[PDB]
Amino acid sequence: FCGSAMATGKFLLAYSPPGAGVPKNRKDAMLGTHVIWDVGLQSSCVLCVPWIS
Amino acid sequence: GLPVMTTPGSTQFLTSDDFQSPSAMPQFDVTPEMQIPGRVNNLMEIAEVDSVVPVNNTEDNVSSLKAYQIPVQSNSDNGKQVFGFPLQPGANNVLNRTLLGEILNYYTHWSGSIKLTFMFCGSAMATGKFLLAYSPPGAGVPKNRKDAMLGTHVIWDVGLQSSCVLCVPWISAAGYVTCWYQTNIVVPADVQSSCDILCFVSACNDFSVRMLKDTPFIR
Amino acid sequence: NVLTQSPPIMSASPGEKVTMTCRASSSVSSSYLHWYQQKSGASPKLWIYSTSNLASGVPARFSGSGSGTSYSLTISSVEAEDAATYYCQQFSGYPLTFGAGTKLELK
Amino acid sequence: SRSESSIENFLCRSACVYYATYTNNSKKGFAEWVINTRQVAQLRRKLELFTYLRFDLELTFVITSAQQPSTASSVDAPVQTHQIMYVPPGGPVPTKVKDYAWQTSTNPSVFWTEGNAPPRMSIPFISIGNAYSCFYDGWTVYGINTLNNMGTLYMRHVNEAGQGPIKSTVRIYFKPKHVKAWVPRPPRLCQYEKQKNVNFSPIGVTTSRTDII
Amino acid sequence: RSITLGNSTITTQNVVVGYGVWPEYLDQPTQPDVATCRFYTLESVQWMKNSAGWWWKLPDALSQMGLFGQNMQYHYLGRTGYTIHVQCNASKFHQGCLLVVCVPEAEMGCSNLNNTPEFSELSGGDSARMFTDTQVGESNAKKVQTAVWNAGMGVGVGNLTIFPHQWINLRTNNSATLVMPYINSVPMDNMFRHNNLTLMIIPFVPLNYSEGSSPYVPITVTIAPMCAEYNGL
Amino acid sequence: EVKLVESGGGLVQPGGSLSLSCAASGFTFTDYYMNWVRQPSGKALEWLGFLRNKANGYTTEYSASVKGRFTISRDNSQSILYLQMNALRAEDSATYYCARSRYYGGTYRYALDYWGQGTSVTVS
């Protein structure tokens, strides 16, 4: 997060597996695997994910 | 057979007796227990928790949530009364309907001390100072900042800590918990100045009650 | 709950001190009783709110008082622009009932 | 002096909860009371401080009689006798004086002549659940909780009248025993409007004063 | 910090636990754990200036939330515990104070003096209901009396701190955490007919800010079921 | 300044329908309670119902006599206020105002400070 030092917020980082569709809403993005990223505490969120040919 | 002789007071129904009673439904095999959390063994354990005090009644905040907040603003006068309330027991005061005062209207004799927790619910950039003068029973209410300083008091700095605890006895004049402005509320730019103060009350854990009666908070 | 004002018609010369009353059938709280003033053929205007506090832009001659179930509005000195109709409002339960109305005609 | 605030000394008291009349000859004179805790307003407020309770019960009836105005000609009657039937939850219920439900076998009842000590009886803790529930946020109709249902009581004469009518009153007294409480709750501020539910009208928090200082 | 459960992860940094007990286990029951123990983040409510309060009914707010909404319809009985995380994010120029309480068996009262409130007005399905700061009328048929100074239960709003609570003060604190065990008379109850908890959020000292700052502070509630077990074959 | 205008009045048959509209200008529209007060020809006022602000969920509280016949709502895009009338009778011939409410302390006293100029509706 390359922003100010006084600004806060929250973000979802939803990853969908191969085969499942893209989430078209916030709620069914929450039901899949996700990481909620709070900006006010930490400013860097690491997510590990497989990639195949 | 065995010769007996009945005393006076034999076939009477005392409403506060204790006798063995015949069971209506024997051989019932009653339902056993289950460990339910939060068992109350004594009614003092209800009064040990802290409750907000409606210390801002003034006839138009009683039907709102502004009954619990004390308005504090940066005025121009040095030395002024923020609030003040007597500790006269039950005589329409502010500790009447609270959770401490709702148990102690069941008994007629009680004695002990009281924790009084305050809390500054304002901004994080605002500072100030407050006196918390307590007058003992018998002495008058202080009518000035100077003779409130000569009595027993606790000076409460808002910038360092945001909660000041004061312990005080309460018996069945009875005292005053008046509070005074020491300095104004110094505040930076682009911050609001009107901050509020909450007040809490509890039981100090060594106090007893006796002689149960019924409550007057009913028709 | 109903409000009955008295008198319905009331006349006063300029310079005197005059008063009107507003009586309720049941007990109405002191912070929920207001006064309005409607001139001839105009929209009404708020005059006194919470039974003793002046509105914005009202002159300081008006002052309300009273408590319990009987409230009153008294004018200290009668002038030439304060000849209109005055209503009182209440709230103990829904709905909000207005008063009958006290008309003030100049002499 | 910290022991009168115990739960055993706070709730184990006696309180008049019911008061009913019944005459003998009018063919619809018999009393009725569904046993609940929400009858009188003073005992109800002391029981809604907690959420789950568990107690035995002790009932004592103070039955007296009073002679109604008969016609004439030397009214004389022997001593009267009352029958106080107790119906368990889910049993037969009478509807007239002379009925089949009075002479049944599994309804424990007491018989009492006049001029003796008043007839105490004791009801144990009858429920399927492990504790009574003073509140219930849920449907069965909303907020009913059909699990804590303790039964009903019925009173009637057993003497048939020959020359003079007699009506009688009864004051059911109420006394818990071996009380256990669980989860305390803040005391009710508003008044009590209805018996079944917890409905109310909004009220101010505290009585007022003129200023803050 | 950075706790994870199932396939969900939140970030934390003081926790108050129930009535002193920790949530634990006990026909025959089954215990599913790999698919229910995760953080169901409800969506965020907005705290404005003249706000009044919010409430959620607890085994009703998760009635559509994924697999926990499927095990409520397939299995008849069940018993769970909960773990609630509340955190609102404001800057250093805002001010206010919340009260986060969790009431067990919060029976509410209707506006009409004779009826009982309907189902759609007691609990919004994964949506927060709101208190009001004025009275609710008498003339409407069946709606919840939501005067906030009586908390909808006919009780004093100040004495609500006897239940397990936690203060959120924007001067020094930011978040709250509660852990609630299963409090019921029967050892296993239905999950449709009953709502054994109620999470309430009440602003005592209202929000205030200067001109220029963002005029709302969002609140985020995150619930996670703990030690759940259902009943069936 | 607070500027409230309203329009939509006129003549209408008994048993018919009519929709008024009250426009607001000069303040934040999603912050204040908006009332509706009618008045007959030189008689006492009557209160109809109000609609709460955005912080309380936009609910309505009608009076007892007009419950089910009238309908108060607002438009989401611009600052305008509606009043949908149905099943008009002969006694609904009055002069309709459009008042605002405000918070005096932090409390809500039930006063009505700023009033509209008043539209008229007759039936025959």
The domain in which residue B33 lies consists of: 1-219
Neighbours of chain E (3+ CB pairs under 8 A): A, B, C, D, F
Q: Residue C7: is the preceding peptide bond cis (ω within 30°)? A: yes
Helix H or strand E segment including B146: helix B146-149
Helix H or strand E segment including E8: strand E8-9
User: E134, E135, E142: which to substitute to probe chain F, counting the most F Cβ within 10 Å?
Assistant: E134
The domain in which residue D91 lies consists of: 1-213
CA distance E154 to D188: 6
CA distances from A6 to A2, A10, A41, B127 (A): 12, 14, 11, 21
In the DSSP assignment, the letter for residue C90 is: -
Q: Residue F58 — left, alpha, or beta (φ > 0 → left; ψ -120 to 50 → alpha)?
A: left
CA distance E107 to E198: 10
| Coil, helix or strand at residue A28 | helix
CB under 8 Å to A5, separation ≥6 — which residues?
A: none
Residue E78's domain is classified under what CATH number? Answer: 2.60.120.20
Phi, psi for D46 (deg, rounded to 5): -80, -15
Task: Please state, as a whole number, how many other Cβ atoms lie within 10 Å of the Cβ of residue D34.
Answer: 12
User: What is chain D's length?
Assistant: 213
For residue B82, how many C-alpha atoms fall within 13 Å in the half-sphere facing its CB? 29
Both tokens of D183, joined, read 């989860």
| Coil, helix or strand at residue F41 | coil
8 Å CB contact between B185 and B74? yes
Q: Which of E137, E142, E157 is nearest to E55 (CA)?
A: E157
User: E102, E134, E159, E166: which to substitute to probe chain B, counting the most B Cβ within 10 Å?
Assistant: E159
| Chain C CB within 8 Å of residue F2 CB | no
CA distance F39 to F115: 13
Tally of helices (H runs) and strands (E runs) in chain E:
3, 16
CATH class given for the domain over C3-106: mainly beta
CB pairs under 8 A between C and F: 47
F70-74: strand order across its sheet? F3-7, F18-25, F80-85, F70-74
The domain in which residue E201 lies consists of: 1-233
F55/E52 touch (CB, cutoff 8 Å), yes or no = yes
E49/F55 touch (CB, cutoff 8 Å), yes or no = yes
| Chain F CB within 8 Å of residue C64 CB | no
Both tokens of C36, joined, read 């309005």
Of the partner residues E93, E170, E185, the one whose CB lies closest to the CB of residue B191:
E93
Q: Which residue has the tokens 């994080």?
A: B124
Number of domains in chain E: 1
Give me the torsion for CA of F47, F51, F52, F58, rounded to 10°.
160
Residues in chain E within 8 Å Cβ distance of C96:
none
E92/B125 touch (CB, cutoff 8 Å), yes or no = yes
List the resolution, Å. Answer: 3.5
8 Å CB contact between B22 and D120? yes
B64/E97 touch (CB, cutoff 8 Å), yes or no = no
Residue in E with minimal Cα distance to A35: E9
User: What is chain E's length?
Assistant: 233
For residue E11, how many C-alpha atoms fall within 13 Å in the half-sphere facing its CB? 17
The domain in which residue F89 lies consists of: 3-123
* F positions 69-108 inside 8 Å of C (CB): 97, 104, 107
CA distances from B42 to B208, E97, F106 (A): 12, 32, 40
8 Å CB contact between F5 and F79? no
Helix H or strand E segment including D11: helix D8-11
8 Å CB contact between D24 and D197? no
CA distance E75 to E229: 10
Radius of gyration of chain A (CA): 13
DSSP characters over B64-116: SSTTS-EEE---S-SS-EEE--B--TTSS-TTSSSHHHHHTTSEEEEEEEEEE
Tally of helices (H runs) and strands (E runs) in chain F:
0, 11
Number of domains in chain D: 1
B66/F105 touch (CB, cutoff 8 Å), yes or no = yes
Residue F110's domain is classified under what CATH number? Answer: 2.60.40.10
8 Å CB contact between D68 and D166? yes
Number of domains in chain F: 1
| Coil, helix or strand at residue B45 | helix
Number of domains in chain B: 1
Q: Which of E76, E78, E86 is nearest to E219 (CA)?
A: E86
- Quick one: how far is CA D111 from the chain centroid? 19
Both tokens of B7, joined, read 């005393």
CA distance E10 to E40: 11
CA distance D45 to D187: 7
CA distance D120 to B21: 7
Phi, psi for E59 (deg, rounded to 5): -85, 45
CA distance D121 to B23: 6
CA distances from F54 to D49, E128, E212, F74 (A): 37, 14, 20, 11
Residues in chain C within 8 Å Cβ distance of F63:
94-95
Residues in chain B within 8 Å Cβ distance of F105:
60-61, 66
B179-181: strand order across its sheet? B81-83, B179-181, B129-133, B153-157
CA distances from E34 to E7, E38, E83, F80 (A): 10, 9, 16, 52
User: Distance, in angstroms, between D146 CA and closest chain E CA?
Assistant: 13
CA distance B208 to D4: 9
DSSP-derived pairing of the beta strands F37-39 and F49-51 = unpaired
